[PDB]
Structure 1
Amino acid sequence: IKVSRRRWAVVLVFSCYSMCNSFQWIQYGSINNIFMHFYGVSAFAIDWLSMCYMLTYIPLLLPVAWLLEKFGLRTIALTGSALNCLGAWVKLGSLKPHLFPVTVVGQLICSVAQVFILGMPSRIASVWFGANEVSTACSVAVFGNQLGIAIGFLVPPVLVPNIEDRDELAYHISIMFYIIGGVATLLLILVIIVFKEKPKYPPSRAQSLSYALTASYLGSIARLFKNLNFVLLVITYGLNAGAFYALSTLLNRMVIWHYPGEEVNAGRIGLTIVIAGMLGAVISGIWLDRSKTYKETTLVVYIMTLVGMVVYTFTLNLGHLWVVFITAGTMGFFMTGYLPLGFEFAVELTYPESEGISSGLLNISAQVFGIIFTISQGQIIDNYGTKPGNIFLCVFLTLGAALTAFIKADLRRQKANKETLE
């Protein structure tokens, strides 16, 4: 058993094109106010580009899990990157006001690329890393996806100003499409040369035993719903992660609703939410490494998310840009930091079930509730304004906060750990 230098190269290249793919998810959402003008469509149409990532994940996750089990790690890496690259190049042919379905086709291809991407941050961690480095590698791969949202918020409004000239607008969006298409192609070329089917030597004793050994997905998902505590977590995780998806997808229509212009700052706020959550996730992760208070920390963070969501809901109105930056970062510290926290707490209640099944069902719950939230809050924003849409998120987070309080600390991994110790 030996570890290899290439393990980091695989992580960064995956994290780079996972960042690239998550760039394309919010690519339209981060500059939603302008893509409305370019294609001449209503708001609900553009969020579907971010929502088609969410709608496609639900039915195709199980077939993609089947593909990974047969064709291995590398083919999913190539297929995810190639579809991300192909979807990026397709968007070049959509640079006209009358070619909106073309970018939908391209975004669907990128959305079909996501199921090959979000499923294997933890999968790469087990294949390439030793036991102590799995949690470090898994975080970096996941934070790469989050960094894509942050970079996908900051960059697109810098490249594309708000201009009503259709032809100059087509010119700037082309540059973003060219860079993202160029970056995806470069990453695809990198994926071809650095990704390998298997390491040279097994990286850990756990991985070596897996290779030496070598239940089903249908059986695992069936037994998981027996655990009431896990069922409660899935509903609450979807209530929180789905709220973040709706908040980030609709962030343009609310920040620019009260602040005309300020597309570049609205991207920074989106970056601030994601970046603060990245800092908040690390703090919570290290805190759990010493305290192991998985239930108490999760409930406090969920409550702090509710207070963070409530405070941002009522501070968005006064019109002070800096206070919106502070509370969005304060909310993101807990709301975005909960996203990796929920996966860690899910393994607590589901050990020894594999992380893939637990993360996948939480991912489905995030997609399902995100779509419900995005559609509903989108209709609430149009019909009743931005604050009721945010309060609508607060109500479900209040329900999520109350529901998490009834979750019992059935930390079966902790029981298993102390059983091995004694």
Structure 2
Amino acid sequence: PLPLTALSPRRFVVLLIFSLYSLVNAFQWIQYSIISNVFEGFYGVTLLHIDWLSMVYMLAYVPLIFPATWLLDTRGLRLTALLGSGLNCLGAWIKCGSVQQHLFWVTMLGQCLCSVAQVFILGLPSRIASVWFGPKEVSTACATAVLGNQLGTAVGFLLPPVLVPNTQNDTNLLACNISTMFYGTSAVATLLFILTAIAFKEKPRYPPSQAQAALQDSPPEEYSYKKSIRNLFKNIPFVLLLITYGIMTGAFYSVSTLLNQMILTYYEGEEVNAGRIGLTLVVAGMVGSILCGLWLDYTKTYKQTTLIVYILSFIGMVIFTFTLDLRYIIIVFVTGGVLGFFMTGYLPLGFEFAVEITYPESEGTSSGLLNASAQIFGILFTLAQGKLTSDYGPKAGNIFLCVWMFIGIILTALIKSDLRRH
């Protein structure tokens, strides 16, 4: 109680503003893929181009996460938030000027800018929660921050199909709809960036928590990211957890990117239904994350719960694979909901397991490695599954995903640890 601790209303504002612009970023990640056929027709490109529009996020994250983490640690929260918001706004504005049949590269540049923004955006939740919220409010603030990005992904799934119908016959109408969507996104991003500039302060006048007061009082300490990574790789259980988490997240990313292709293969004129399926998957994933966190809290064992969740995710993936072609959209809805539930439920559990197993290694390095593995696996799975679907049909790529999930289960079982919640 020696230092003075107080809570300011501005924290909520900050938690809102980030949760908004981060949301927007997530939207921009999946806007193209969900209507990938429409953009393919408009730009006269192949589906691989639209897949790369989504994979640029993953590609940009891998080489910039560690530099971004260092910048956040050294310069503070405000600079990172401003960078993320401004980059997202600039990417949206560039996309606004990319609405033409011969200007795909402008949209690619805007998407790359949004990808660079994501690197700054993704790391802010926990740091903001610690800096601006008290001990009891930290968990809720972090949950809201992550839910912002998840809701952004869900909205990116749902909205573009409604906003941009597949009017390939009329180029003017398609261009007008794409321009409307881009201008709306740009306006929202600009407003959020202005709000971040005006109100997003570095930290409150007084620390919200005693732990935050101690952290701020402590002098800065330099950390060697390379040494931390080398020590982490020595931990074979952590390597196995990294591989499994990357496999699962990459499978989710590949399914999200190629969902439109799989749905359009068997159901025609169902882009809106595909977006609804994606939104159902994301919402079920949120619910599964909450329920799996509760299950882990009750049972208190990382290994058993993680393995069971992985097995359930594999079963759901197989069910979706072998039910997609039944030509019933409701079955696709249910299977996608179950699959997203289990897949997104796995992610927090695996992340916590990897963070705890790596102790006392810095959480930043482990988080960066986990996310980089997720991005790499997502890129590889997206490429392989897209090629398989184009050449042999969605079932081949889905079976490839199922095989990778089975390999992930095998790796998870091989993990040797008795770690328990403390």
Q: Aligned ranges for residues 10-409 of structure 1 at < 5 Å?
A: 10-164=14-168, 165-214=170-219, 215-409=223-417
How far did 1:130 drift? 2.4
* Contact 1:238–1:369 under 8 Å retained in 2: yes
- Give the SS at the match of 1:250: helix
* Contact 1:150–1:275 under 8 Å retained in 2: yes
Q: Is 385-394 or 122-131 further displaced after alignment?
A: 122-131
- Give the SS at the match of 1:94: coil
Which 5+ residue runs of structure 2 have no aligned equivalent? Answer: none
Q: Is 56-65 or 175-184 further displaced after alignment?
A: 56-65
- Give the SS at the match of 1:317: helix
Deviations 1:189-212 (A, max 9, x none): 111122101112111122111111
Deviations 1:46-100 (A, max 9, x none): 1111101111111111221222122210111011000100000111111100011
Distance in 1, Cα, partners of 2:41 & 2:86: 30
- Give the SS at the match of 1:131: coil
Distance in 1, Cα, partners of 2:349 & 2:44: 40
Deviations 1:298-339 (A, max 9, x none): 111111000010111001010111111111101111112222
* Contact 2:69–2:364 under 8 Å retained in 1: no
* Contact 1:122–1:356 under 8 Å retained in 2: no
TM-score (norm 2): 0.95
How far did 1:410 drift? 4.4
Q: Which amino acid aligns with 1:161?
A: P
Q: Which amino acid aligns with 1:254?
A: M
* Contact 1:349–1:410 under 8 Å retained in 2: no
Distance in 2, Cα, partners of 1:65 & 1:54: 16
How far did 1:120 drift? 2.0
Q: Is 342-351 or 390-399 further displaced after alignment?
A: 342-351
How far did 1:409 drift? 2.7
Q: Which amino acid aligns with 1:75?
A: L
Q: Is 40-49 or 2-11 further displaced after alignment?
A: 2-11
Structure 1 segments of 4 or more deviating over 4 A?
Answer: none
Distance in 2, Cα, partners of 1:229 & 1:382: 37
Deviations 1:230-251 (A, max 9, x none): 1100000011000000110111
The RMSD of aligned alpha carbons is 1.3
* Contact 2:89–2:190 under 8 Å retained in 1: yes
Distance in 1, Cα, partners of 2:11 & 2:412: 37
Q: Which amino acid aligns with 2:179?
A: S
Q: Which amino acid aligns with 1:325?
A: F
Deviations 1:371-408 (A, max 9, x none): 11111111111111110100000000000011101112
TM-score (norm 1): 0.95
Q: Which amino acid aligns with 2:31?
A: Q
Match of 1:5 in 2: 9
Distance in 2, Cα, partners of 1:24 & 1:102: 14
Q: Which amino acid aligns with 1:97?
A: Q
Q: Is 339-348 or 294-303 further displaced after alignment?
A: 339-348
- Give the SS at the match of 1:97: coil
Q: Which amino acid aligns with 1:94?
A: S
Q: Is 349-358 or 55-64 further displaced after alignment?
A: 349-358
Deviations 1:158-207 (A, max 9, x none): 11111011111110011110110011111111111221011121111221
Distance in 1, Cα, partners of 2:54 & 2:256: 10
| Aligned residues with identical type, % of pairs | 64
Deviations 1:108-154 (A, max 9, x none): 11111111111222222221222333232222211211111100000
How many residue pairs align between the two structures? Answer: 414
- Give the SS at the match of 1:306: helix
Distance in 2, Cα, partners of 1:295 & 1:143: 26
